[PDB]
């Protein structure tokens, strides 16, 4: 239920890796091409327009960096291990396939499936979006 | 006024910020980006519309009208671009990014952290809703119909 939990984890592709959060209540994410600093800033802005409260990380990688740790200090989020995602950085593949011929540079086409992802009906047709959904829980959050 | 936003550029430290700034709530997204208005122009709104509806962008000066980048991107997403920008925002923001820039060393980190702050404080102390607040009860209001 929780609105502001989150998960995070790397994907590569020509060579360059890619960022992904995903908030979990709703299929939400976001992405960027990419060190530390650059998942610190990354989180960052993340957290500066939606509540990001707990960062979920399967990895020790994101443990290690003195940035990252400087940020979630900052920003008052909670990076945890433990844990979707892997069903989801191949629809995004499979997204960023059908767009790659239109944008000239990889970090374009990462965007366009990111816009596809949250703009498209989850269910294909009728209900909400992933960016419509995401939007509602928090709406219903503060009125609590 | 739901998915209309106003685009402006401010300066500090040598450098370009551009500044959406979603009319209704006062919501802002900002980001360093070229003197150059083009490919990271069309970036940053690309990326802006993944995130929030973006119907149409008002600007009062021509900039945002040179660029094949640009008129593609808003193509592409779906959004129009209309001119006159009817705000002060930038005004603050560079207050705050002074008040937080010693606690980063690239200005970049500090706009993020300025802008975390605008969108953030208010209902605070007392107040109602921060822009953030303001932004998605508008639009999770919107979707109702
Ligand atoms: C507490 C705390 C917490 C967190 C933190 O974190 C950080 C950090 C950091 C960091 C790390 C390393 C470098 C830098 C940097 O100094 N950074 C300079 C500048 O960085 C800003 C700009 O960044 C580059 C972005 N550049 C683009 O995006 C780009 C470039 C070129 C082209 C394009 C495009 C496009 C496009 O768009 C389109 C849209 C539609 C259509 C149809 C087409 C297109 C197209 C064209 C196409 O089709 O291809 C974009 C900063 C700190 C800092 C600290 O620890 O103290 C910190 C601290």
């Not at 060190?35 to 939606?50: D, H, N, S, V």
């Amino acid at each position: 239920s929780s609105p502001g939990i989150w998960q995070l984890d790397c994907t590569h592709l020509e060579g360059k890796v890619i960022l992904v959060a995903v908030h979990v209540a709703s299929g939400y994410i976001e992405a960027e091409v990419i060190t530390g600093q650059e998942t610190a800033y990354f989180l960052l802005k993340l957290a500066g327009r939606w509540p990001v409260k707990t960062v979920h990380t399967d990895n020790g990688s994101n443990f290690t960096s003195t940035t990252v740790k400087a940020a979630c200090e900052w920003a008052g989020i909670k990076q945890e291990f433990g844990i979707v995602i892997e069903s989801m950085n191949k629809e995004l593949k499979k997204i960023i396939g059908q767009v790659r011929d239109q944008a000239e540079h990889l970090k374009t086409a990462v965007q366009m499936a990111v816009f596809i992802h949250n703009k498209k009906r989850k269910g294909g047709i009728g209900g909400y979006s992933a960016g419509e959904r995401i939007v509602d829980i928090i709406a219903t959050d503060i009125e609590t």
